[PDB]
């Protein structure tokens, strides 16, 4: 009855790789004008999961959210199958003959690009090899969400271009000033994360800890795992920092910050920073005018910290002024001067505000050429649209943020015929046939290798090691003597703030058709599948909107914000954190997508619409509204003049949490360094052991003589040697939310749709629930807490007892492993568990899964069918291949032979996972620590992942209160 599913092995065996076993290639990952490092699994030359590069010290083996979804961007459906000309999918072979003849005998030809920001020498050198021939190449780096604004503020401050590195382990006290240094949206998310986390990591009854002082304008994830946070509208943070420095001593600076002479949180920190010279830091976010970053240079130089804000000289790239080029481009479009328009990886029709027109110019000019990954709003309007490779087939070169000089390993052949990666296309413009990127790229290195060993010992070494070691720019000294002090009066007011901000899960919409990311809860609010506007209850109760729910689904009102006659509406959600007259409308989520695959109707007797998330179209359609075109490109994160109109179409908005604010419950139990100094036994004090009875873990049951651990059949295997457990240094855990996504890819899952998750089911195993704790609602100070919660694979384990169909068991080593076969779906596996983590494959999402994503589910784990539970399993899959590899050859399992996904992805080294009963490993040090926070231990459950609490560190008085 069953099919006869064949096996089609190699013909021309590649010698290194082997069929059953993956092997780790060492790629990069570009975005946002820089290139994170990375490390793939590459099951038989097919990528399945990404990981970190442990050798590269910038990352030391970690991967934020924004990479693991890109792995699925690679395997999307509806990418760029055919080459589209005019909107017609016609043909490629004519284009090469076409574009080649255009290129060789062109002459001046007046072309333009509007690239993704380079951050690579092959791109920047081929630019010169290009510009050598054609006269004027305007070469605008259209930064996502305009100029980065950390750098333009510093080209005058130091007199030349520069980028910072921001160690944070040599530095304790950090005034953020809107800086999402711990934000997946921002760059260098690891080195900002880790050496900040180490400052937060104690391992002692008391240690010197960061004690940041964040003053955000919009509640953001960095402001959560934080101390003494403040809400204060952007466009006025300059006025905040104005009266700030006058209380430090740099200059008068009084007039801009008129009203903050004697504010508590200002005068508080000022004495501290001058009291912490080689340890204090002053950051600056992205929602400002650049004079703030002058002040980030002035005070941070004046403060004495230079080795703590490690500073690095770029390759003479100061020229990223969005006004200066992008308008100046279309000022040539309207004159018929510029003819060709070579976009690389961008959607400026989606982006690029109408205040400085793009589409009005785009339709004027023929010879348009959009290299592109999706087909959104630019392919549809162009005359030529190349398909694009992802970076996995580029042979690209790329710089890590501000440091080393990495290079991609391309893993897979171009999955689609005629993808034609941008780099060789940019060289195809250089009056020759399509340059083999393998040979093209190599030709740059010999001019710039900077290694006395030749290629086939160096190229092989760098392509191996993932990073060219010695690079990393030279470090500049103090250039500023109070130059940049003359753009203050842009502190304008008189209107609702309409500030933009990129969610951790999407970046200028460029990764929207990405389910692992799209169905990813934001850390602030567990929101999915819709852009939003978050704001205070005091404005809501002064505006007239709510987040009412009479079904646990958060029905939502709308705004219909209106800027310069370019209005759109969107759901309004509310948060008790944000300040007056300000809303953080997140981008992406409004990106129209055009499908090649059918909608896949099946009979009404059969469910497809609820399951076929890829059915009704591709993903990025109608998930929200597009918001980028509204802003003004001057200081192009903020905005004024939103004539709000509370209108109808009040539709749903869906979350996983659905609620918040535990009623004084024992689930985070924050504590101060003062209190921690007093009672290290406080993780237990909330629900201590009993009158005269044992400590809580290892507490006897009724049974102790017939307990299975005392019986052989649980004790007799090749496993009991190494009991497994997984603590969480919760003090550095803030909503990066990459603790999830690596679980989703390592131990495969499907996604879920808005129409489905509205009823509250999500097949994310690792909830990353957030919570609010105020002083009994004193001033509505949220003071959030984030904490992941996998299935703490219990010992007493109610769930194990209760599957009648023995689909659960305390497997050896604390593992409580689920079998996705034996279960039947009576779901009472889940109802017992206090932690509703036994998720359930409600519908058969995988059956409707297309012929594209199926590359991605890794070829080592049991994908699951309708009517089946599932849970964490501690990423058992990589216990097995390791313990098996130790069953072949006699050995133990090292401290780091195995790394879980929640471990290996969380850049803050929170999770450690090393086997219990192996005292040299990190877990036994992190469990033997004072705060072995045992979450809901009181139910006599005796679980592993005996994780840690947070220790928020307030300030001595110093006029704090």
């Amino acid at each position: 009855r069953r099919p006869v599913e064949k096996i089609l092995p190699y013909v021309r065996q590649p010698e290194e790789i082997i069929p059953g076993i993956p092997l780790y290639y060492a790629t990069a990952m570009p975005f946002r004008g820089s290139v994170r490092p990375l490390l793939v699994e590459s099951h038989e030359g097919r990528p399945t999961k990404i990981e970190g590069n442990p050798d590269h010290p910038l990352s030391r083996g970690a991967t934020g959210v924004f990479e693991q979804a890109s792995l699925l961007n690679l395997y999307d459906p509806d990418r760029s199958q055919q080459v589209l000309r005019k909107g017609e999918p016609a043909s490629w072979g004519d284009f090469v003959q076409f574009a080649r003849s255009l290129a060789a005998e062109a002459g001046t030809k007046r072309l333009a690009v509007l690239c993704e920001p380079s951050s690579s020498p092959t791109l920047a050198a081929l630019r010169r090899e290009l510009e050598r021939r054609y006269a004027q190449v305007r070469w605008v780096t259209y930064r996502p969400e305009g100029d980065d604004h950390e750098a333009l503020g510093l080209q005058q401050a130091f007199g030349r271009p520069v980028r910072a590195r921001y160690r944070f382990s040599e530095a304790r006290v950090i005034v953020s000033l809107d800086a999402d240094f711990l934000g997946p949206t921002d760059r260098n998310f690891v080195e900002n994360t880790r050496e900040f986390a180490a400052s937060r990591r104690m391992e002692r009854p008391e240690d010197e800890i960061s004690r940041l002082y964040v003053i955000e304008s919009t509640y953001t994830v960095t402001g959560g795992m934080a101390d003494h946070r403040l809400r204060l509208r952007a466009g006025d943070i300059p006025a905040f920092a104005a009266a700030l420095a006058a209380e430090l001593g740099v200059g008068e600076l009084r007039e801009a910050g008129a009203r903050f002479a004697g504010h508590p949180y200002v005068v508080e920190i000022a004495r501290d920073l001058r009291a912490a010279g080689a340890r204090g830091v002053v950051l600056a976010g992205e929602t400002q005018p650049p004079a703030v970053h002058a002040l980030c240079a002035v005070i941070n130089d004046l403060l004495g910290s230079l080795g703590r804000t490690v500073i690095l000289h770029a390759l003479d790239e100061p020229a990223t002024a969005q006004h200066a080029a992008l308008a100046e481009l279309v000022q040539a479009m309207q004159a018929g001067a510029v003819d060709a328009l070579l976009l690389l990886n961008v959607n400026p029709v989606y982006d690029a505000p109408a205040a400085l027109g793009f589409a009005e110019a785009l339709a004027q000019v023929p010879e348009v050429i959009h290299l592109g990954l999706h087909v959104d709003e630019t392919a549809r309007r162009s005359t030529w649209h190349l398909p694009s490779t992802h970076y996995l087939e580029a042979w690209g070169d790329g710089r890590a943020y501000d440091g080393t000089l990495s290079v991609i390993q391309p893993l897979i052949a171009p999955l689609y015929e005629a993808a034609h990666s941008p780099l060789e296309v940019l060289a195809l413009l250089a009056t020759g046939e399509e340059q083999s990127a393998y040979d093209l790229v190599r030709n740059t290195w010999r001019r710039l290798l900077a290694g006395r060993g030749a290629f086939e010992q160096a190229w092989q070494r760098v392509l191996h090691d993932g990073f060219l070691p010695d690079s990393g720019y030279p470090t500049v000294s103090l250039r500023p003597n109070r130059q940049a002090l003359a753009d203050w009066p842009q502190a304008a007011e008189g209107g609702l703030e309409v500030v933009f901000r990129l969610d951790p899960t999407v970046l200028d919409g460029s990764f929207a058709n990405n389910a692992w990311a799209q169905e990813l809860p934001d850390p602030i609010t567990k929101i999915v599948w819709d852009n939003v506007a978050i704001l205070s209850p005091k404005t809501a109760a002064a505006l007239g909107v709510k987040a009412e729910y009479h079904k646990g689904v958060y029905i939502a009102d709308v705004i219909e914000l209106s800027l310069d006659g370019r209005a759109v509406e969107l759901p309004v959600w509310v948060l008790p954190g944000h300040p007056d007259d300000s809303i953080t409308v997140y981008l992406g989520y409004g990106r129209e997508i055009t499908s090649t695959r059918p909608e896949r109707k099946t009979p009404f007797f059969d469910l497809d619409d609820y399951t076929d998330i890829y059915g009704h179209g591709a993903i990025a359609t109608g998930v929200g509204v597009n918001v980028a075109p509204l802003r003004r490109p001057d200081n192009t994160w903020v905005a004024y003049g939103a004539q709000v109109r509370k209108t109808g179409r009040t539709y749903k908005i869906v979350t996983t949490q659905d609620h918040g604010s535990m009623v004084g419950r024992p689930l985070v139990r924050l504590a101060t360094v003062e209190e921690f100094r007093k009672n290290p036994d406080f993780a237990k004090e909330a629900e201590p052991p009993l009158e005269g009875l044992e400590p809580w873990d290892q507490y006897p049951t009724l049974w102790e003589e017939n307990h299975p651990s005392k019986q052989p059949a649980f004790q007799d295997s090749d496993y009991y040697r190494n009991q497994w457990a997984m603590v969480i240094d919760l003090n550095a855990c803030t909503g990066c939310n990459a603790c999830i996504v690596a679980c989703d890819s390592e131990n495969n899952i499907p996604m879920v749709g808005k129409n489905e998750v509205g009823r509250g089911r999500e097949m994310h195993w690792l909830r990353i629930d957030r919570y609010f704790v105020s002083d009994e609602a004193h001033a509505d100070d949220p003071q959030i807490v984030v904490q992941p919660v996998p299935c703490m694979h219990c010992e007493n384990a109610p769930c194990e007892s209760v599957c009648p169909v023995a689909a659960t068991v305390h497997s050896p080593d604390g593992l409580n492993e689920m079998v996705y076969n034996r279960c039947i779906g009576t779901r009472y596996c889940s109802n017992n568990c206090p932690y509703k983590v036994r998720r359930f494959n409600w519908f058969n999402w995988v059956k409707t899964l297309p012929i594209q994503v199926q590359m991605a589910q890794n070829p080592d784990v049991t994908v699951r069918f309708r009517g089946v539970m599932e849970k964490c399993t501690y990423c058992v899959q990589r216990i097995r291949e390791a313990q098996r590899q130790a069953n072949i050859e006699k050995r133990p399992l090292r401290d780091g032979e195995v790394k879980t996904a929640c471990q290996q992805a969380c850049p803050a080294e929170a999770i450690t996972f090393g086997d219990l009963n192996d005292p040299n490993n990190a877990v036994v040090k992190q469990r033997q620590n004072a705060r072995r926070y045992e979450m809901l231990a009181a139910l006599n459950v005796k679980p592993r992942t005996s994780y840690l609490a947070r220790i928020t560190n307030p300030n001595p008085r110093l006029l704090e209160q």
């Binding site: 052989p712 004790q715 072949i888 050859e889 050995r891 005292p919």
Partner: protein, 156 residues
């Protein structure tokens, strides 16, 4: 189920005697470790790090009698000897392996190198195209000591 329980009862005895001979060796090493690294290391958790196994090893001896006597009491159930033997060897090789992991750190501080005679040290699974583990298990077995690990450090 070949011929009953009484066949396996010889080898289960042959395991418990290895444990009994290791009561001497472990407790002997526990003297020697206090002698070798008197003050050459932290030693405050790290010596007790070696003792914490010892109370478990001795506890299993009284059990290995109880495990075994529950078998030899009635030899009519084959599905207890294979299990009691699979438990002993695991509860045995573990404690051998746990002694080692605490004992290799001894060399790791006295010697600046945890030696190349430490473990099989084979490598990951993709390092089988170069080095099958078959080679490694003939390195590990024929080089690494189970509990001649610190007496080896008497040569240092």
């Amino acid at each position: 189920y070949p011929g009953g329980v009484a066949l396996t009862l010889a080898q289960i005895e042959a395991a418990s005697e290895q444990v009994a001979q290791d009561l001497e060796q472990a407790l002997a090493e526990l003297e020697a470790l206090r002698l070798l690294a008197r003050r050459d290391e932290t030693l405050a958790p790290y010596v007790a790090q070696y003792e914490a196994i010892l109370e478990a090893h001795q506890q299993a001896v009284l059990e290995f009698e109880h495990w075994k006597e529950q078998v030899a009491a009635h030899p009519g159930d084959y599905r207890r000897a294979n299990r009691t033997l699979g438990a002993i060897t695991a509860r045995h090789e573990a404690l051998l392996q746990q002694y080692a992991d605490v004992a290799w750190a001894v060399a790791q501080h006295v010697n600046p190198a945890l030696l190349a005679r430490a473990y099989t040290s084979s490598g990951p699974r993709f390092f089988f195209y170069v080095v099958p583990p078959q080679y490694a298990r003939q390195v590990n077995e024929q080089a690494v000591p189970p509990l001649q690990v610190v007496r080896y450090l008497a040569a240092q």
